[PDB]
């Protein structure tokens, strides 16, 4: 079970980090300050050109990935045997 | 049809009733358009090209190539530069290639040059979501979406580049080769492979038939490995 | 990237003014990349044109430039020449690495070349494309009005309404990689383009292949198909500036010089192929016959095959061939040239 426990731990490692990033950063002996502040708020109730440059960069690498996939399938031995 | 010697011909082939049968054969010669000859051919070969020759003589042939599920006919009819295939011929044959499950015709007809922003009218997009077997899963999802075209609500209860509309179309009807081709043509590829993997696994848990749920889990594994390799 | 190419290139209407029409160019079709176009003056240098293509648009330096001329078959060309332009020209342009320079418009032999490029791009998966370029006069463009905004770096949505083919305006073809649009200022007629065309061909022919340099001069060849009377001045203006040429059988507009190189029956030949102006055109054809060295024949060949050996035959007739074998990245040519013990 050692390999499946590594695969499970890495996937859970994202949501554990996200839990600490989403916490009110004040220690639990002194955390009453942040709970008072959230109680007050409860009482009262990229740029476009940067995304275009990013997505065209992604599409360049997509095309190189698909061309190398087609060359690897074409130079395989079974498709040489089909073409002969 | 190669052409009184008429009365001669009606008196050594049939051997009886010359002038009545001559009136019959001349009735056939009134419509000599609808008559073909199979003489100087290969013999027991290339029957299909002569069927197309008879149907074009009696006159759409690209739509016949889709309907017979035979690709070499359509390919040879596109290399012939005398015809100069226009837009509405290619658009009609592409709808026949999408309603049926023929992905190699979709690849061949898009590579020839065709506008898809002019193609996907909302009438045609309404026709694609009605190519549904009535005892499937997407039929119940669309009917419950209208009970309270409406594919955005179907995505909500589950979750000019129009390539993403055809990707969502091919995922909801579980077409494997269609959805992979529409992934390879559109942009924003890493997020769309993870979105395809999510949507297929949600619909695979909700599937009644066991073979179709097995089919959807195999396709979702394919989209996961493509996002891994691209990233 | 758009402002300096607006200012350096100019257009004249004659007041010579900065440009407004350049950038990318998409069509209605899907799955394809963008083509580059530029509204350029007629009296401008090809030096900044070459630097604009090979450094800003993005293109490798050519190893070969072949210009396609003709166009006597308007609606339908023969299937024989259709197979020659499909196989023999484009597979050598894709293997050796080359530019095809034709008129960018639909008319003439522009459609037949562009269909050959698209059919080569569809019938195989070559993982690349054949760089075909086009020059066209600005006044003959069908709807040039979709190109006018002087800002720059934009896909201009070019449109085909499906119009009947009038002989005043012509639409651009959709199978080329880049377009040159020359603002001559007459707005009426094909013919005011060929000066910049021949100057740009000779400017490419003057430069050389290589990494930093130290290579052969890029061989520029001319490919003649049927054509009209308006090409005989172009054949002579080309062969005056030291450019080789090649001739296919085709029809009579090239068979004029084919028969005259196989050899008054002269005045006869000048009065059934062209059908007009005997003695002036006879003076032109005899100007071509002064330099019969720079003329080759493609008649009794395989057809759509062994194009590259005939290119070497034309360049050696006009005379290094081992260096051409290195520059084209093709090994069988050099190997066969080393086994020849002569």
From Swiss-Prot, chain B:
Ca(2+) 1 binds at residues 60-61. Disruption phenotype: Mice have fewer dendritic cells in lymphoid organs and impaired migration of dendritic cells is seen. It comes from the Eukaryota. Phosphorylation by PKC leads to increase the sensitivity to Ca(2+). Sumoylated. Desumoylated by SENP1. ATP 2 binds at residues 86, 113. Sino-atrial nodes (at protein level). Widely expressed. It is found in: Cell membrane; Endoplasmic reticulum; Golgi apparatus. Homotetramer. Calcium-activated selective cation channel that mediates membrane depolarization. While it is activated by increase in intracellular Ca(2+), it is impermeable to it. Mediates transport of monovalent cations (Na(+) > K(+) > Cs(+) > Li(+)), leading to depolarize the membrane. It thereby plays a central role in cadiomyocytes, neurons from entorhinal cortex, dorsal root and vomeronasal neurons, endocrine pancreas cells, kidney epithelial cells, cochlea hair cells etc. TRPM4, is a temperature-sensitive ion channel, it adopts distinct conformations at different temperatures, markedly influencing where and how ligands interact with it. Decavanadate (a positive modulator), ATP (an inhibitor) and Ca(2+) bind to different locations of TRPM4 at physiological temperatures or at lower temperatures. Belongs to the transient receptor (TC 1.A.4) family. LTrpC subfamily. TRPM4 sub-subfamily. This is Transient receptor potential cation channel subfamily M member 4. It comes from Mus musculus. The gene is Trpm4.
């Amino acid at each position: 079970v050692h390999g499946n426990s590594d695969l499970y731990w890495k996937a859970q490692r994202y949501s554990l980090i996200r839990e600490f990033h989403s916490r009110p950063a004040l220690a639990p002996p002194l955390i009453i300050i942040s709970h008072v502040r959230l109680l007050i708020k409860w009482l009262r109730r990229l740029s476009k050109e940067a995304e275009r440059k990013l997505l065209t960069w992604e599409s360049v690498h997509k095309e190189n990935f698909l061309l190398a996939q087609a060359r690897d399938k074409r130079d395989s031995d079974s498709e040489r045997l089909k073409r002969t | 049809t190669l052409e009184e010697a008429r009365d001669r011909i009606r008196r050594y082939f049939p051997k009886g009733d010359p002038e009545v049968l001559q009136a019959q054969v001349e009735r056939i010669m009134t419509r000599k358009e609808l008559l073909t000859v199979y003489s100087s051919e290969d013999g027991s070969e290339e029957f299909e090209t002569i069927v197309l020759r008879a149907l074009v003589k009696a006159c759409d042939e690209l739509r016949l190539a889709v309907a017979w599920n035979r690709v070499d006919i359509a390919q040879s009819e596109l290399f012939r530069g005398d015809i100069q295939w226009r837009s509405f011929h290619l658009e009609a044959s592409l709808m026949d290639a999408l309603l049926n499950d023929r992905p190699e015709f979709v690849r061949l007809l898009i590579s020839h040059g065709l506008s898809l922003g002019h193609f996907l009218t909302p009438v045609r997009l309404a026709q694609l979501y009605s190519a549904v077997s009535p005892n499937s899963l997407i039929r119940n999802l669309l009917d419950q979406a209208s009970h309270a075209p409406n594919v955005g609500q179907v995505l909500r209860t589950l979750l000019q580049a129009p390539w993403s509309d055809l990707l969502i179309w091919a995922l909801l009807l579980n077409r494997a080769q269609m959805a992979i081709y529409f992934w390879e043509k559109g942009s924003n590829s890493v997020a769309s492979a993870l979105g395809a993997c999510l949507l297929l696994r949600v619909m695979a848990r909700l599937e009644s038939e066991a073979e179709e749920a097995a089919r959807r889990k195999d396709l979702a594994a394919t989209f996961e490995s493509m996002s891994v390799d691209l990233f | 990237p758009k402002i300096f190419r607006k200012k350096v290139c100019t257009t004249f209407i004659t007041t010579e003014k900065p440009t407004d029409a350049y950038g990318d160019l998409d069509f209605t079709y899907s799955g394809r990349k963008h083509s580059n176009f530029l509204r350029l003056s007629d009296r401008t240098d090809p030096a900044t044109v070459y630097s604009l293509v090979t450094r800003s648009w993005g293109f490798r330096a050519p190893n070969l430039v072949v210009s396609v001329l003709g166009g006597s078959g308007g609606p339908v060309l023969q299937t024989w020449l259709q197979d020659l332009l499909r196989r023999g020209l484009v597979r050598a342009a894709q293997s050796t690495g080359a530019w095809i320079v034709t008129g960018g418009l639909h008319t003439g032999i522009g459609r037949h070349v562009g269909v050959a490029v698209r059919d080569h791009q569809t019938a195989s998966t070559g993982s690349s494309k054949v760089v075909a370029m086009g020059v066209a006069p600005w006044g003959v463009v069908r709807n040039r009005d979709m190109l006018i905004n002087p800002k720059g770096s934009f896909p201009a949505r070019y449109r085909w309404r499906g119009d009947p083919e009038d002989g005043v305006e012509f639409p651009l073809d959709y199978n080329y990689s880049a377009f040159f649009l020359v603002d001559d200022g007459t707005y009426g007629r094909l013919g005011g383009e060929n000066r910049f065309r021949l100057r740009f061909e000779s400017y490419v022919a003057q430069q050389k292949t290589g990494v930093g340099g130290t290579g052969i001069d890029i061989p520029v060849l001319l490919l003649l198909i049927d054509g009209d009377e308006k090409m005989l001045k172009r054949i002579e203006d080309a062969t005056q500036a030291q450019l080789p040429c090649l001739l296919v059988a085709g029809s009579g507009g090239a068979a004029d010089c084919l028969v005259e190189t196989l050899e008054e029956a002269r005045d006869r030949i000048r009065r059934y192929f062209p059908k007009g102006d005997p003695e002036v055109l006879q003076a032109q054809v005899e100007r071509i016959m002064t330099r019969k060295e720079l003329l080759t024949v493609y008649s009794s060949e395989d057809g759509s095959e062994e194009f590259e050996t005939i290119v070497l035959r034309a360049l050696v007739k006009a005379c290094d061939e081992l260096r051409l074998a290195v520059a084209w990245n093709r090994v069988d040519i050099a190997q066969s040239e080393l086994f020849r013990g002569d």
